[PDB]
Structures are given as C-alpha cells and as structure tokens.
Amino acid sequence: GQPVNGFNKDLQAVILKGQEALTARPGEYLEPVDFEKVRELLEEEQQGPVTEQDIISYVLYPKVYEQYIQTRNQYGNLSLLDTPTFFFGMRNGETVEIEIDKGKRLIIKLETISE
Amino acid sequence: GQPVNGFNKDLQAVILKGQEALTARPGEYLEPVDFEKVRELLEEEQQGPVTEQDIISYVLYPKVYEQYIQTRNQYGNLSLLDTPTFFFGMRNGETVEIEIDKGKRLIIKLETISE
C-alpha cells in the first residue's frame, strides 16, 4: 500500500533493480480466487464435508492450514487440554482430567515412563 | 561328650565354676520329647497337613523350621527356581521361565521398575 510522501525517484529506482512498481492498490491487480475449486480440492485431502470457514482459512494461510489438518488428524482437538498439560504434559504419578466433548471427561494418570 | 584324655581339673574349674559338669553322655540326662504333644502344636498352627517329617524337623530346628513354613506360605516352593533367578531376581527386558510343575512353566518378562 502506497505511503503519504510517495518515494524519491533515484532512491526507488536504485533499490528496485527496475521491477513494476504498481501505482494502483496491490489487491486490485490480484485476480479473484476460484472459491469452488479450493472447496473441491480441499475435499480430496480430508474425508468429505468442508465448511466455508475451512475454505477461507486455507486461502489466507495455505501451508499453515494444511499443517493444522495434520495435527487434528493426529492428536484431535488440542484446545480442550488445560494450558499446563498442553505445554508440559504430565509429571510422573499425576492425575489429569480432559473433557474431549460434553459429558466425555477422561481421567488420565501416568504412572511411570520407562527406558 | 568326653575327650580321649578327659579334662584338666584346674582349667575346668576356673572356666565353668558357677554351674557343674556332666559325667555321662548328654542325652541320658534329658527325658523323651513328646511327639504327639508336638504334632498337635504344628496341627493347630498351620491348620492341617502335618507329617512325621515335619515333626522331627520342628524338633531339630524349632526356630528355623517355623520360619521356613513362613516363607512357604508367602512364596511357595522356591527350590523350583533356576539358581540365577533365586539369587538375583530379574533385569528389565529379561525373559525368564519357571517350572512350577511338570507342564506348567510360566514365561515372565520384567518390563520396568518404577521410582
């Protein structure tokens, strides 16, 4: 996005090596995203059902999003952990409770880790 | 018993004076043991199965016998272990076999020990 004073001719041309310095608003030259195709190529990666939320999130953050679907594929919904368990796990012989869903609270006690 | 050449009357005197010496074989002095009075003790104590073998064994080693009978209630026929296991127990990641009877051998792995 353009600034208040513009630029200095000699200053701008020397730094740019001579690439197209767009006069217009950066996000006007950028071409519309094929929303249905994202929705369509997001469905072969996952199981099937994909919400509008899933759709923009990806576009906005392509690889960052692909990665989140690796971790919910693995460990489920990690938000449900209390913060200390999320960061540090558990110390030996502790009892922790995790509510994975309304009325499904698992009581987890780690006894010892081995060799 | 009596030494080939008897005792020196002096030495004996300074050693044992307080009580007095035996002249005959020690067993003559003591009356018989009552093995029936014994059998009932051992009956009453371990609630049933008691033989002539236990009777002389109790009578010969009163404290040590009582004790072994303590270990056999606790640990069972230990003599059946292979001698390495007897003395050392096990190490983690070790797989050991114990014949408790002909055809009944137990396969026992120590995974780990906790803190």
> What own/partner pairs with CB < 8 Å and gap ≥ 24 does B99-105 have?
B100/B76
CB contact under 8 A, A114 and B115: no
Closest in B92, B114, B115 to A115, CB measured: B92
Please report where in the chains the tokens 């797989």 appear, as a residue: B95
DSSP code at position B31? P
- Amino acid identity of A20? E
Q: Is A92 on the interface with B (CB under 8 A)?
A: yes
Angstrom resolution of this structure: 2.9
Residue B49's alpha-carbon distances to A111, B37, B40, B42, B54, in angstroms, are: 42, 16, 11, 9, 10
If phi over 0 gives left and psi between -120 and 50 gives alpha, with beta otherwise, what is residue B47?
left
CB A22 within 8 A of CB A7: no
Q: Is B92 on the interface with A (CB under 8 A)?
A: yes
CA angle A41, A46, A49 (to 5 degrees): 85
CB A99 within 8 A of CB A105: yes
**Closest-CA distance of chain A to residue B114, Å:** 6
Residues sharing a CB contact under 8 Å with residue B110, sequence separation 6 or more, in sequence order: B90, B91, B92, B93, B94
CB contact under 8 A, A112 and B111: no
CA angle B111, B112, B115 (to 5 degrees): 165
Q: Name the helix (H) or strand (E) containing A110.
A: strand A104-110
